Amino acid sequence: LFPPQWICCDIRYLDVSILGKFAVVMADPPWDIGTLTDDEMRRLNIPVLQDDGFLFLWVTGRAMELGRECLNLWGYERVDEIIWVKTNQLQRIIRTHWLNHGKEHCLVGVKGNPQGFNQGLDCDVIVAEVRSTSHKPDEIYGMIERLSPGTRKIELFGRPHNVQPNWITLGNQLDGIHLLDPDVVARFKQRYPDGIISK
């Protein structure tokens, strides 16, 4: 079911096996640099979410190393690394421990052998205006769509502005639950017949 879907929940406690498999997984975790500890990050059940496809993992500070650990622990090889150069409304780098930071990093991991992906269409540098705090640029959805058109995708730790067609967005600041894919709605009812996601 093509239109935006989402689940308000705590990604630590949701039974993500009800969601199926995804061609692309994207994630913008609250690394401890409301955060999640390194073992909580390590323990997330990313491995069940895909058989073949790509993981896009935003990282910063020591998460550049830690996210490489999770990415390998979850079963991925890191094959690329996107750099978002943060500009203002006039295309100047905004700046802002040893060097000011002009950019944020997004690790690209492969799992399995994904086929039919349009590798090569975009390049590994995004130039896009900064917005709210920790708000990533919408350009990433275009590149991901051009890479894997029409396939189902999952975002972790999204806010409402992250909801996107062909995606299922998970976060604890989403307005409730909104599921349309019938296969998911089925498995969600069975696993959550009263609608509460705890433990």
């Binding site: 094959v79 690394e81 040893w98 950019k103 690209v108 540098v125 350009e139």
Partner: protein, 234 residues
């Protein structure tokens, strides 16, 4: 405007559209710079321990196969005894390319005892000319230089035009970032070339056509009272 869509449409990399006091510091650096020193040496067959004294800054620029499209593999780079020529407090800048080096370069930094404080990234524009690794998902338009610290004004971006094919030179801007940190005056550039020789720096590399390095002459520059100068000092 979506520059990623623009690039797909036109071949103009998003970085093409990025737009846009310290001289006294630059002059202080230039005064306290040691004479340039340099030494031809095959670093594979070379006991780097012969390189003394111990260094405050190490710039490391091994010739990676990906730069050409003797190369060094990350296997060969991981085996360098960098920890034996670094001072207890010291810094490293390691050119890692844009592929597996981004992961193997980190292992190296830990291998030699550093932790990564900064990820300096060289973004290459293609304004003058609007190729793929098999494992690659996207077109590679940047290179990474990882900064490591061990022991107790500038930005982390360098933007220049993509050099000619077969030009393996890295942007001389990295030297300004390094020297503006004021990290010490013993600076070693491993795998430098004739074209990278530079005051304030000792260059060791297999292609250098001449050498002037002398271990005792070099240490003469740092004997007291000059032991602990930052390099930004009178």
């Amino acid at each position: 405007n979506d520059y990623c869509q623009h690039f797909v449409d036109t071949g103009h990399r998003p970085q093409n559209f990025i737009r846009d006091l310290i001289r006294l510091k630059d002059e202080l650096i230039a005064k306290s710079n040691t004479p340039p020193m340099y030494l031809q040496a095959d670093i594979e067959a070379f006991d780097i321990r012969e390189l003394t004294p111990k260094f405050d800054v190490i710039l490391l620029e091994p010739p990676l196969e990906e730069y050409y499209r003797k190369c060094w593999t990350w296997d060969d780079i991981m085996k360098l005894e960098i920890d034996e020529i670094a001072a207890p407090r010291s810094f490293i800048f390691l050119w890692c390319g844009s592929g597996e080096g981004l992961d193997l370069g980190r292992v190296c930094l830990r291998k030699w005892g550093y932790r990564r404080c900064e990820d300096i990234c060289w973004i290459k524009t293609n304004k003058n000319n609007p190729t793929l690794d098999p494992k690659a998902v996207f077109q590679r338009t940047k290179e990474h230089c990882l900064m490591g610290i061990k022991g107790t004004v500038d930005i982390d971006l360098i933007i220049t035009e993509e050099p000619e094919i077969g030009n393996i030179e890295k942007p001389v801007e990295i030297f300004h970032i390094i020297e503006h940190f004021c990290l010490g005056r013993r600076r070693l550039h491993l795998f430098g070339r004739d074209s990278t020789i530079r005051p304030g720096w000792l260059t060791v590399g297999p292609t250098l056509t001449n050498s002037n390095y002398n271990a005792e002459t070099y240490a003469s520059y740092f004997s007291a009272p000059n032991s602990y100068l930052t390099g930004c000092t009178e």
